[PDB]
Write a protein that binds this ligand. Structure first.
Ligand code: NI
Ligand code: NI
Ligand code: NI
Ligand code: NI
Lengths: 598, 114, 101, 299, 114, 101, 101
């Protein structure tokens, strides 16, 4: 028995219970809630260290042997600081057969008490001391346009995409739609040679038979886009097929209000669960009250990253976007009126506050159509940074503990998108039984540049230097494709998500797919209350004239450390007893010019 | 103050390693002409034969009866270095778990004798 | 350096604009690719300086005159678009008809 | 298929190989042709080592590892069936000849099951524990399975001196990785392995040119690699006694005499995979500059 | 003149669109508080319920008999925008083909009544 | 030229360091990547000049001061490592805490 | 920019020649790759200027003298060949023994 200072302890194994580390260059702190190790028995690999034959590494058991409930792992990540919706804590991570097999204490049971996972002869060690480990992100709004989005997504901590498209065709440039058997097959065949988990959405329009055959072809869901016609029939019939096939539905609602207002769209849903893409509505959706979907229980509201940090440059950048996107000539009044009523600082600013409340549950990108696939995580924490700076600590948080806010925000791109598309049993969090999709971050780089990205226990992309160098940290130190992207390991370390009926149809043999196909499930039984930390349904109303977005007084309760009455003295009041959600745009953001060349 | 990305804020208090595991103070002397260094979890009964042990009373222990089934009471992953001719006082604790040693120098390869 | 892929591929603009800048200094009339690269580099370095997006959409139109490019190049460069890391994060800058007057 | 005279036997005498309709021709006049090099000490860390190795004249690697994991960063070990299979599957999509090494530690069955998975040999690294039991059991399994064993011997002398390791070998053939000992091995007398008949001694390229920049580079290498703070006397003592100009200088002469038989790299852990040939010939240059023509050689 | 790469030379004369499709002049009024924009080929019988139609004589048509089986007589892919409280005169023509409407708002989902 | 892969990939350092040098000349405070690239380029050019390894380890710490980089960057750059062809062959240069004082 | 692959890969020559030019400015004797890159860049920029092919084949032999390169490099550079877009289309330029006198 002896004593060690916390500074000397962190030098050896990383910080422990009660200590806090700053997330990147933001204003956020995470505090270690618990430590699953035993002090003095930490597992460390190196010359003359614990994990050696007979001392910390068991030397008798085989890879398939068991002692109690403990097993010999293929890979163990020692002293990992786990940041997850389940908690923020220190533990060893055990990986076996490409899945997370154990979270707890590693070592040799012959010499150490309470060993949950066994470091054996067939075990590889990754030293996670001093680094933060999170589950791989999910991007559920991706236009399938060019293959280089995959390395960019991995560079942003994204390990899974729910996409749709046909390549650089104008239909894909506008919508996330893989129309028909051919383009669903082509998407799955192309994904077969990319190191990412992928599922694809078909065209949710027309009668029942044309929609159904797309799902039988292997599509894991449907996207209803107004460019294909987001009418009442399309909403009703797409949901009818999806309930029969247990697949998700995403919608890009009618911006022109051509066949009804937002209430007409909601009525056509008839209580069936839908995924509201970019519910703020800058890039599309019922003008101007599409943001009101956050009040309905059968809607999973999602936001795209271009508007997520409300900044000084947002309005000017977005105003010019539509004039190019839809060839809006700034000389005809109709084009300007359609755009001036579509980019609203009122709803863009109110969107950030709703995220802090938990009214919007999912973060996405809208890859290469309106947003950025490599910045899903970065802009999520930028928004979390802005909310803390302007509204203080979230409810239950303290000076060096933003754990409640961190868990709420990390859920938006890890577990909530997984639940929405019915793949939460496979991915979306760092829990036992899930795929070993893990992203490592150095704390000074958290939310900007990951250290390595692991796909089912194998590193797919990581920071690495000169291959000729004596050590792997020599300039030029860049993010490089790893062994997980080569040979049969490429088709062993990622999966393709398909519908159950498509999988039962033998599309894997018909399409000659080499990857494993996993069926989506439980897509219809989930609703807003299923989302972790993001199940709020405030009474949000968008003023048809002033575009102001306001909530009730009780909707401001349990939000922040400051009570609703104090918040009532800062938010503007409408004629009714409602309070307008607003905040000044951000000028300087973290996870920004301090990190990125260009 | 100065904005340090990834800064660490420490809690108040010290950390107790190997709590509840009473330690014994012994001596180890290197008699060889080359340096030796022993890790925290190495079975001390099986260290280099040039190391000579001295029990808690200071008397030499030729059969290493004080080192049987014990390891250094030092932070996990660290080590203790003995230069040629050097004699150090060290703290040791009994091994835990099922108390079996397999491998190392093959001197036990089974359950430690009770 | 810890360079992501999107950072690495943007170094292509820097080299291409460097080629265009030297050729302009020799009195050469810039072609389509040289003109686009040179205008893009002005936007990228301007965003690094901390200029507003609105400022760059207007100032990128004064980089090159009609007489500094080959015949027809000014009509070929209808729009130039590039995304740079502003102080507030990554933003899109679109330049409409940069080569005029 | 043949080495000799090519052409058409219908018009030429003593034709050993026939240039026919189905024959392609490469003109090698004025060029030197050698066999592809073999790099037997490669850490399996990143795929781009393959194009670099080919850029250095290397066509075959005997490697070990799991990618950019710390265990691979330290040792050339593909632990177990999963990682051996992953290495083989990754090599299936790379243009290089490849074999892989497993973890040479533990009891007989855990070692053997790795070889049953397809590993072509075993690596005994001190970071996994290079003890007497590990050496004995790895050699026993290798003799039972006809595979090679490479060793990174105990630098700390923790379980014995170099003679203890040699005795634990029991006359069975072993491959002595980086026998000079700069990056690892029994301090400081691991080089003595060049005197034993059952040892194949190998050197890694970082020390193979003894140059003016070697000592400072390697000292800083050690201060970085094991987090040696140049403020605690133990770390400085362990480093200063580990980078010895004496053994580094003597290694080149031993290579010139033929005492060390194998050149290697220690890819991305201590040495350079693209320079195995280059530094080798550099060594051949230096010796000639300092000791003249080798026996039997002329102007 | 100036060398314009990919220049276009136009022929003489105008282009007659929807030749032979006689058009009817009607009026549409937006009664909602949000803007409505309707495409060229949208079945006018199934447009937003806030739109109020007026027949060729200017009298209101509550059951939209003037809009049944008809679309706008405007260039394909264009649209007509109705701000709240706005009443525009528009030109409409009968649908062609086999004259079946399937989808849209599901109001017909079959052959148009003759 | 007969460039090997490592030679080709080392030009990225040259381009990034040129970007960093131009931005420094404008009075901008360098970020993490720009500072790392500039120090690496200094080391590479010094090795090409024929300096000793130790001289470069000591002189790469005078390329950038604390006031020439953004807040926190000096604490971010703990170590920079690069291998270059010295007159006697390829050698590794490691710079510890290059951005101080 | 709409850069084809050959255009993208030709920027490697620009970067390597920039490195060679900067090292020549410091008074260093150029090696094989630096000399080849510098001569190739001279040829490329001359072709962009509008010189005739024969003029470039003759003028690329005055870019570097024997005393400006390391010993043996002049005998190493037997020929340098590069294809560039002249005013009349793509043409090949071959320089024989560029490093003489
Ligand atoms: Ni959309
Ligand atoms: Ni989209
Ligand atoms: Ni070694
Ligand atoms: Ni090695």
């Amino acid at each position: 028995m002896f004593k060690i200072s916390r500074k000397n302890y962190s030098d050896l194994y990383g910080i422990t219970t009660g200590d806090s580390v700053r997330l990147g260059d933001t204003n956020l702190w995470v505090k270690v809630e618990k430590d699953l190790t035993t002090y003095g028995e930490e597992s460390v690999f190196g010359g003359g260290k614990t994990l050696r034959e007979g001392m910390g590494m068991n030397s008798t058991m085989k890879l398939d042997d068991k002692l109690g409930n403990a097993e010999v792992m293929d890979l163990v990540i020692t002293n990992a600081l786990i940041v997850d919706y389940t908690g923020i804590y220190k533990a060893d991570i055990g990986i076996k057969n490409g899945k997370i097999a154990a979270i707890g204490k590693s070592g040799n049971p012959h010499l150490t008490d309470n060993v949950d996972m066994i470091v054996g002869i067939s075990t590889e060690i990754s030293a996670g001391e001093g680094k933060i480990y999170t589950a791989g992100g999910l991007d559920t709004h991706v236009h399938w346009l060019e293959p280089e989005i995959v390395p960019v997504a991995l560079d942003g901590g994204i390990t899974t995409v729910i996409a749709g498209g046909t390549g650089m065709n104008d239909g894909t440039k506008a919508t996330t739609v893989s129309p028909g058997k051919f383009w669903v097959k082509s998407a799955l065949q192309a994904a077969d040679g990319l190191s990412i988990n992928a599922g694809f959405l078909a065209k949710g329009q027309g009668m029942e038979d044309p929609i159904f055959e797309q799902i039988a072809a292997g599509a894991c869901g449907l996207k209803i886009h107004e460019d294909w016609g987001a009418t009442g029939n399309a909403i009703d019939l797409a949901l009818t097929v999806a309930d029969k096939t247990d697949v998700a539905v995403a919608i890009h609602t009618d911006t022109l209000n051509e066949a009804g207002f937002v209430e007409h769209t909601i009525a056509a849903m008839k209580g069936r669960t839908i995924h509201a893409y970019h519910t703020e509505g800058a890039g599309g959706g019922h003008a101007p009250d599409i943001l009101e979907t956050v009040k309905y229980a059968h809607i999973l509201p999602a936001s795209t990253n271009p508007t997520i940090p409300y900044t000084v440059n947002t309005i000017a950048e977005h105003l010019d976007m539509l004039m190019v996107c839809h060839h809006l000539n700034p000389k005809v009044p109709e084009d300007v009126a359609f755009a001036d009523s579509r980019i609203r600082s009122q709803t863009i600013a109110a969107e950030d506050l709703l995220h802090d409340m938990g009214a919007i549950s999912i973060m996405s990108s809208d890859t290469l159509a309106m947003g950025r696939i490599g910045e899903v995580a970065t802009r999520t924490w930028q928004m979390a940074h802005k909310m803390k700076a302007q509204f203080g600590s979230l409810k239950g948080d303290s000076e060096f503990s933003d754990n409640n806010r961190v868990k709420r925000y990390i859920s938006k791109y890890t577990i909530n998108p997984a639940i929405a598309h019915g793949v939460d049993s496979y991915i979306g969090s760092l829990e036992v039984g899930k795929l070993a999709d893990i992203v490592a971050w150095e704390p000074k780089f958290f939310g900007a540049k990951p250290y390595y990205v692991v796909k089912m226990g194998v590193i797919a992309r990581c920071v690495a230097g000169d291959p000729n160098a004596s050590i792997p940290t020599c300039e030029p130190v860049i993010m490089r494709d790893q062994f997980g992207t080569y040979g049969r390991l490429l088709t062993n370390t990622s999966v393709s998500f398909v519908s159950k009926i498509g999988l039962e149809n033998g599309i894997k043999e018909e399409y000659k797919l080499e990857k494993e196909l996993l069926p989506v499930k439980n897509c219809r039984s989930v609703n807003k209350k299923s989302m972790k930390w993001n199940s709020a349904t405030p009474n949000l109303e968008v003023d048809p004239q002033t575009f102001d977005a306001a909530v009730d007084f009780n909707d401001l309760e349990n939000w922040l450390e400051q009570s609703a009455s104090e918040l009532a003295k800062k938010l503007k009041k409408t004629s009714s007893g409602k309070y307008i959600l607003d905040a000044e745009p951000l000028t300087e953001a973290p996870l920004a010019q301090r990190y990125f060349l260009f | 103050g100065k904005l340090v990305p990834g800064a660490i804020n420490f809690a108040s208090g010290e950390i107790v390693m190997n709590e509840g595991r009473e330690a014994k103070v012994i001596s180890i002397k290197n008699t060889g002409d080359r340096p030796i260094q022993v890790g925290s979890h190495f079975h001390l009964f099986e260290v280099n034969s040039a190391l000579v042990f001295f029990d808690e009373k200071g008397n030499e222990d030729k059969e290493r009866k004080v080192a049987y089934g014990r390891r250094f009471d030092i932070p996990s992953g660290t080590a203790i270095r003995f230069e040629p001719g050097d004699k150090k006082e060290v703290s040791i604790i009994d091994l835990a778990g099922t108390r079996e040693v397999w491998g190392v120098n093959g001197l036990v390869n089974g359950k430690l004798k009770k | 350096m810890n360079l992501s892929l999107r950072e690495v591929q943007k170094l292509l603009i820097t080299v291409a604009a460097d080629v265009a800048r030297r050729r302009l200094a020799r009195g050469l009339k810039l072609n389509y690719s040289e003109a686009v690269a040179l205008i893009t580099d002005h936007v990228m370095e301007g965003a690094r300086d901390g200029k507003l997006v609105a400022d760059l959409m207007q100032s990128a139109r004064e980089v090159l005159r009609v007489d500094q490019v080959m015949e027809g190049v000014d009509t070929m460069v209808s729009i130039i678009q590039v995304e740079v890391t502003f102080p507030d994060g990554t933003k899109l800058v679109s330049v409409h008809d940069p080569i005029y007057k």
